[PDB]
Write a protein that binds this ligand. Structure first.
Ligand SMILES: *CCC(=O)N1C[C@H](Nc2ncnc3[nH]ccc23)CC[C@@H]1C
Length: 278
């Protein structure tokens, strides 16, 4: 659970995100290149708010125990770094693009069921992910996906089922629920809206030409956020992906219900995805 700074050997950059970076390191106490590979997150540059938010992320991940959530390994102190298991297949978005001629509808349904099971578990922990997208899902194997990146995650108080953010988000706007776009309201029901966008991503194999951004922009002087909110309020939605099974498209539409209270729960979605055959 405690990793010594001097034994973590830098190998390469895995990613850069919101005020932080994830690096591939080898935890090599023998110094002979035989140690295990780990994914290590740290804050890129100082900030008091970012530091509090980083400690929050570590506290959230440390207490999550699911086959469908990236495993917390430990921390290194200077909390300097968050140590996690390394998944060499990487993000689901790039994985789907490379293996599209190999993965069938059954396989996409299996991934959908696994993400929905991880999300049902997050909900049971009163955790709001706030950044669910195929780029934030990791691939353990050909038949196993895991939710990652809890950098924007929040724990709901026992007496409040949503939360309000002071400043508007910094993520691509095409995954946000209408209530998040209009009032900065986030809940487990806005994670359900984002999951509908994840299902769309899976069934387009994350093809850039019909991505949520390429397609919403194509359907779209007025600000882009306000224009997307206008489209959504009118009842306009992303179209059924090419060759998408009708039942899968119908589920995406339920996730995209205008009112958060009308969206299905992750517990109700789960058996439905499993019935379609995971
Ligand atoms: C989309 C490109 C991609 O693979 N990622 C994931 C990467 N994070 C990561 N990779 C492997 N193992 C891990 N364990 C925890 C986090 C990771 C960061 C950049 C992008 C999003």
């Amino acid at each position: 659970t405690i990793f010594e700074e001097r034994h973590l050997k830098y190998i390469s950059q895995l990613g850069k995100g919101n005020f932080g970076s994830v690096e591939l390191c080898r935890y090599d106490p023998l110094g002979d290149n035989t140690g295990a590979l780990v994914a290590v997150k740290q804050l890129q540059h100082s900030g008091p708010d970012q530091q509090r938010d980083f400690q929050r992320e570590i506290q959230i991940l440390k207490a999550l125990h699911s086959d469908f959530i990236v495993k917390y390994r430990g921390v290194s102190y200077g909390s300097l770094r968050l140590v996690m298991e390394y998944l060499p297949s990487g993000c689901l978005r790039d994985f789907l693009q490379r293996h599209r001629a190999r993965l069938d509808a059954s396989r996409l349904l299996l991934y959908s069921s696994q993400i929905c099971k991880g999300m049902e578990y997050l909900g049971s922990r009163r955790c709001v992910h706030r950044d669910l997208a195929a780029r934030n899902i990791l691939v353990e194997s050909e038949a196993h996906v895991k939710i990652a990146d809890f950098g924007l995650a929040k724990l709901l108080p026992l007496d409040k089922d949503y939360y309000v953010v002071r400043e508007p988000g910094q993520s691509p706007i095409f995954w946000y629920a209408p209530e998040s776009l209009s009032d900065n309201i986030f809940s487990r029901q806005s994670d359900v809206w984002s999951f509908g966008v994840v299902l769309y991503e899976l069934f387009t194999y994350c093809d850039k030409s019909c991505s949520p951004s390429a397609e919403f922009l194509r359907m779209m002087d007025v600000p882009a956020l306000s224009r997307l909110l206008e489209l959504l309020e009118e009842g306009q939605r992303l179209p059924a992906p090419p060759a998408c099974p009708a039942e899968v498209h119908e589920l995406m539409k339920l996730c995209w219900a205008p009112s958060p209270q009308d969206r299905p729960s992750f517990s109700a979605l789960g058996p439905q995805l499993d019935m379609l055959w995971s």
